[PDB]
Amino acid sequence: APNAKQVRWCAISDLEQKKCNDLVGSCNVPDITLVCVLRSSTEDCMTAIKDGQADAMFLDSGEVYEASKDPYNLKPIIAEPYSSNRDLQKCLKERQQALAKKMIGHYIPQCDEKGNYQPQQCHGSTGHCWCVNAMGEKISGTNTPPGQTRATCERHELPKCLKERQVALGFVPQCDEKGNYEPQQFHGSTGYSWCVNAIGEEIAGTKTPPGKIPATCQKHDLVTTCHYAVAMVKKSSAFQFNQLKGKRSCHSGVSKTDGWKALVTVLVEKKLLSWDGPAKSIQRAMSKFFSVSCIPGATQTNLCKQCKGEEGKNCKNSHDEPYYGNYGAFRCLKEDMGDVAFLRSTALSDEHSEVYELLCPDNTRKPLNKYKECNLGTVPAGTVVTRKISDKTEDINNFLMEAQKRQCKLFSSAHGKDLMFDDSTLQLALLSSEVDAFLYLGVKLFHAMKALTGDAHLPSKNKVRWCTINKLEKMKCDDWSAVSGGAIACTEASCPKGCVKQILKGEADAVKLEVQYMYEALMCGLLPAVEEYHNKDDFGPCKTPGSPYTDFGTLRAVALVNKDINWNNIKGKKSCHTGVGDIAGWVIPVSLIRRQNDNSDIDSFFGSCAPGSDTKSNLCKLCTKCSLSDKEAYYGNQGAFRCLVEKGDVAFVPHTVVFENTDGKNPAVWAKNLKSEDFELLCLDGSRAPVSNYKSCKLSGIPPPAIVTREESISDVVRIVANQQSLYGRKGFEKDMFQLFSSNKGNNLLFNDNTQCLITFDRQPKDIMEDYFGKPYYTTVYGASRSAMSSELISACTIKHCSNSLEVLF
């Protein structure tokens, strides 16, 4: 026992502890010992993990929000991945995953030299073969046994969007770099803009003429194998959905979506459940809605009267209650202890079609196989949770991954169904450490959960909650709030993206974002209310807002070089950059190069000092060394210009850099004998220009910093910002009380200190991505696509659209 680790799994029932103790014996994972801690309910297992008495458990997706709060403070870490229409390199990953399993004779996907699925797939140990599309999905009916004539497989790899950009050039849709439909479509000849499904089908009520502001189009992902909450009834009964009041019911549990929450949402929407807002209880109204029921975990007696558990176990969130869970709820319906069962579609099977049918919110009934048309909503997968502090996440993940490779019986047991995990689970994958309850559920589901538990917040129309990113920003905001007359409040986040999440969560209202964060924020539906105006010379727009402007103060990214050089002979040259993350030094030039060649600039291109790269890549030679820090003398605008003068003659820098050190402003030894005439810049033609021609001899201009907010909060934010700006800041009536654009607490806190003022963003009848970024920046950096970058935040702002398979795209 040197590096011997313990993973304590919390079991809520005797049946779960039996299955868990089976895995302690039958499952040998090297260096990780499994321990089974027994509690009496779901809630007590959550408390045990919060107390450090257990490490992990599986929770229904409807329990994730409440688990993230006191008195539990748990966080999802491991969950079943879904098959998406945006999975890349799927055959290669599935082949690697299948080869990692410690078993002989299992199906291992076969890929070609490019990593595509081979159109024919075979299970080697059995001799069966079948056909397959680009996503590895079996073409229906093509499975043949050994010794039978095989189905001839075609390549089924052309996506739907690209096969309709050809039946046009022989309305032309806009497609991904991977052939997926873009969420926003623009008709090139009629000027219309509308929003499209994940299959490219038009969303109702989104078309706009050229003179109108386009609709707000959310990203979509086509996903397969969705489970649903359904109302299951016997065919011998006669009541419809709007006659549930007074009936006997049975639910999987009070905290699950398949047994609660989904039903409560539908009852409220259909106006069948009479109940005032939360804090005025949902259980009280439900206890008056149903006559007598079994709802495990319920605190009203009549909602527990139909439960069958023995004393001490009756109505518990535990398999010790025989009617708990999806199969327990069906059992209660079967034994006629209730008139209707609320459970997940996974509990349905064709053997129940003789006696059972589905109660639809349509006030109609349908067979079980119509559950995709007769349901109370989708139910996302459950997840393994642990403490937010994530002290044991590594050990928990290592055990489950190793247990899955070694074919341990994780997702089945002779003792019962849905023990420890959902039996329907096929695999468990580790989630990003960034993932919390908000990211896992997504923005829409999170707010539905937030509203159901009574934590919903309706912000003031007259107060703006400003999000800060550090203690210095919090102090300046506090100074701002103290003089704002109740118009400004302050919240705290760790970083700009944390502020973006708070705004989406309804915990904050506004934050200033640099350009690097605007792509994710605009993806999630946020909009810029006001922008930083930086024209130090012209002040007209700042004293009468709404008056036109000539230059917004935008920085312009230039290539600066006394020698011969043009944009076309840049390859194999001594070029430096301010940093790998900086926008002018790295983002825009690399985007130009990687579009005029095929994506190899990690110095298989150039010669080049670009800090923040591999220790001795070809980069860090012209640059202890090559650090994203002041300790590298070639970092920043001042840096990488010391390169331009000393080590090589080409620099990727903003237009301001030369004026900062030309004509003698930066002593040292080198930096005050150069002239503004000694350095000139390279245009995109290949010509040269004087360094003040940066407004024409430019690679690109970078958009200004924007204060973002929700769409519904826009009008109130600009009006409060405008009112507050007239009072405080540059040339304000009471600016001796407070300053917006400077502070004794620090520099560049809430806004950049060199900001002249804040100008209200005026939305043009164009795509919001091009409206803020500008088409030169949008096309060069993101390819004018909504799929150029992916993150956990963008995924949480993506609508999951279900489908029986992905074959609709081929």
Curated annotation (Swiss-Prot):
Residues forming the Thyroglobulin type-1 domain are 88-153, 158-217
Q: In which tissues is it expressed?
A: Plasma. Highest levels of transcripts found in the liver, the lung, the pancreas and the brain.
Q: Which Pfam families match?
A: Thyroglobulin_1, Transferrin
Where is this gene product found?
A: Secreted
Sorted alphabetically, the keyword list is: Disulfide bond, Repeat, Secreted, Signal
For the region Absent in transferrins, give the residue spans.
90-222
Q: Name one GO cellular component term.
A: early endosome
Which residues belong to any copy of the Transferrin-like domain?
A: 7-87, 218-454, 464-786
SS bond partners: C10-C45, C20-C36, C91-C111, C122-C129, C131-C153, C161-C175, C195-C217, C250-C332, C294-C307, C304-C315, C360-C374, C467-C499, C477-C490, C524-C797, C542-C757, C576-C643, C609-C623, C620-C626, C683-C697
Superkingdom classification of source: Eukaryota
- SMART domains reported in the protein's UniProt record: TR_FER, TY
Gene Ontology BP terms: antibacterial humoral response; iron ion transport
Annotated family? Belongs to the transferrin family.
Subunit details: Monomer.
Entry-linked PANTHER family? SEROTRANSFERRIN, TRANSFERRIN
Q: What does this protein do?
A: Binds specifically to the neurotoxin saxitoxin. Its physiological role may be to transport or sequester an endogenous organic molecule other than Fe(3+). It may participate in a detoxification mechanism for neutralizing a microbial toxin.
Q: What is this protein called?
A: Saxiphilin
